[PDB]
UniProtKB/Swiss-Prot annotation:
Record SUPFAM superfamilies: Osmotin, thaumatin-like protein (SSF49870)
Protein name (record): Thaumatin I
CDD domains: TLP-P
Provenance organism: Thaumatococcus daniellii (Katemfe)
Domain of life the protein comes from: Eukaryota
GO CC annotation, single: cytoplasmic vesicle
Disulfide bond entries: 9-204, 56-66, 71-77, 121-193, 126-177, 134-145, 149-158, 159-164
Annotated family: Belongs to the thaumatin family.
Claim: Signal is one of the keywords in the record: yes
One Pfam family from the record: Thaumatin
Lineage of origin: Eukaryota, Viridiplantae, Streptophyta, Embryophyta, Tracheophyta
Role this protein plays: Taste-modifying protein; intensely sweet-tasting. It is 100000 times sweeter than sucrose on a molar basis.
Listed InterPro entries: Osmotin/thaumatin-like_sf, Thaumatin, Thaumatin_CS
Length: 207
């Protein structure tokens, strides 16, 4: 399948694409404003994620640091990223469908549209100035708006036991982005798409 990753923000990002224990495609790439990067993701993938990283440095050996979303100091992500990272999430072809979501469960760093490029299903978006508004205790020095499980490490925020409810903090993300997951047991805003669909991830969409 095909992921076209478009940086419509006015600042550079360092896109990432991982499943957890391996890169997707080249696993990351710099994207100056306006630049695009189309990747190939193997059918049937489970639990894939796409995110932006901000304020990176990488050397020629591809080794470095980012202020949001860092995946173990590399340019070419093979793990997932350090919060706060807004997340495009997907598992493809799982019995005839595709399932797409955007998640604020690790926080928010960059606004995002995740829309299908082939018919049958609706996209999802979180474009609101979450970082402009972010509750004071959840702000991240380095940039972005952290989730409460990251800031406080409690069972209730982290839903450790599989039981938890919404919180004042989950609800701050759900007031600003109702289509994105705001905590682990949020009512699912998942989208089911035809198996083998293609997609576009647009950062800073309304930019």
């Amino acid at each position: 399948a095909t992921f076209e990753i478009v940086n419509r923000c006015s600042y550079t990002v360092w896109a990432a694409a991982s499943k957890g224990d391996a890169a997707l495609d080249a696993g990351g790439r710099q994207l100056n404003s306006g630049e695009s990067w189309t990747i190939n993701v193997e059918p049937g993938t489970k639990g894939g994620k796409i995110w932006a990283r901000t304020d990176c440095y990488f050397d020629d050996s591809g080794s470095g640091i980012c202020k949001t979303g860092d995946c173990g100091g590399l340019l070419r992500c093979k793990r997932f990223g350090r919060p706060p990272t807004t997340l495009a999430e997907f598992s493809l072809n799982q019995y005839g469908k595709d399932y797409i979501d955007i998640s604020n469960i690790k926080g928010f760093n960059v606004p995002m549209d995740f829309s299908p490029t082939t018919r049958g299903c609706r996209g999802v978006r979180c474009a609101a100035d979450i970082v402009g508004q972010c509750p004071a205790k959840l702000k991240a020095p380095g940039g972005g708006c952290n989730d409460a499980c990251t800031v406080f490490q409690t069972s209730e925020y982290c839903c450790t036991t599989g039981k938890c409810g919404p919180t004042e903090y989950s609800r701050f993300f759900k007031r600003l982005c109702p289509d994105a997951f705001s905590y682990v047991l949020d009512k699912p805003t998942t989208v089911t798409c035809p198996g083998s669909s293609n997609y576009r991830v647009t950062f800073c969409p309304t930019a």
